[PDB]
């Protein structure tokens, strides 16, 4: 949080920078429409399909943080927030935790609290660890913190860092990513630096 506090204390990137760091119309599922030049996306109502988007920008160095706004009524069965390399698939023909189900993506299921990386599903670790059966709830907004100096991926909720969910990310070029299953869900991304 010292480097994070310095990042969040700084004036926030403007509309231009938020758009350049927002969702990519040319790197999202065929079932997703990117709106307002990257500030948000809308997933169209397609059955038995999990669909994702990637940010326009890949980070391999420094500290990067972005706010995801995802309404609770628009999450459905599998709402995953995380990162991916440029080769991670952005679509699958069933309802799943797509982001984190392969070697190229890392995600937190914000509905179940499970972490996914090269994961099928059963036995996925809980995040924060030790909270299984506590029926925790991730609010509408959440902060995603990627530290490429340390090679970690973490999350912050209400200005509180939960600690690193994933480690060993150095040498990779990682993009903000999500995977959604909800018909007409709108996910906002608000990049905050560095």
């Amino acid at each position: 949080p010292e480097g994070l506090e310095e990042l969040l204390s700084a004036p926030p990137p403007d509309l231009g920078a938020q758009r350049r760091h927002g969702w990519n119309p040319k790197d999202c599922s065929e079932n997703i429409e990117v709106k307002e030049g990257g500030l948000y996306f809308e997933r169209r109502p397609v059955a038995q399909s999990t669909d994702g988007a990637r940010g326009k920008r890949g980070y391999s160095r420094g500290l990067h943080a972005w706010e995801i706004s995802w309404p609770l009524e628009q999450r459905g069965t599998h709402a995953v927030v995380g990162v991916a390399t440029a080769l991670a698939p952005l679509q699958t023909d069933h309802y799943a935790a797509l982001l984190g189900s392969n070697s190229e993506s890392w995600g937190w299921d914000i509905g179940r609290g499970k972490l996914y990386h090269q994961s099928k599903g059963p036995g996925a670790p809980q995040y924060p660890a030790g909270t299984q059966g506590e029926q925790l709830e991730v609010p509408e907004r959440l902060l995603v913190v990627l530290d490429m100096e340390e090679g970690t991926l973490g999350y912050a909720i209400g200005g509180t860092y939960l600690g690193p969910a994933f480690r060993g990310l150095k040498g990779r070029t990682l993009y903000p990513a999500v995977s959604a299953v909800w018909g007409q869900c709108q996910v906002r991304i608000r990049y905050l630096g560095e």
């Binding site: 109502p45 397609v46 059955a47 038995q48 399909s49 459905g76 069965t77 309802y95 299953v181 909800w182 018909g183 007409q184 869900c185």
Partner: peptide, 7 residues
């Protein structure tokens, strides 16, 4: 109108 708001 499935579980994930898709009919």
């Amino acid at each position: 109108w499935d579980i994930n708001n898709n009919x």
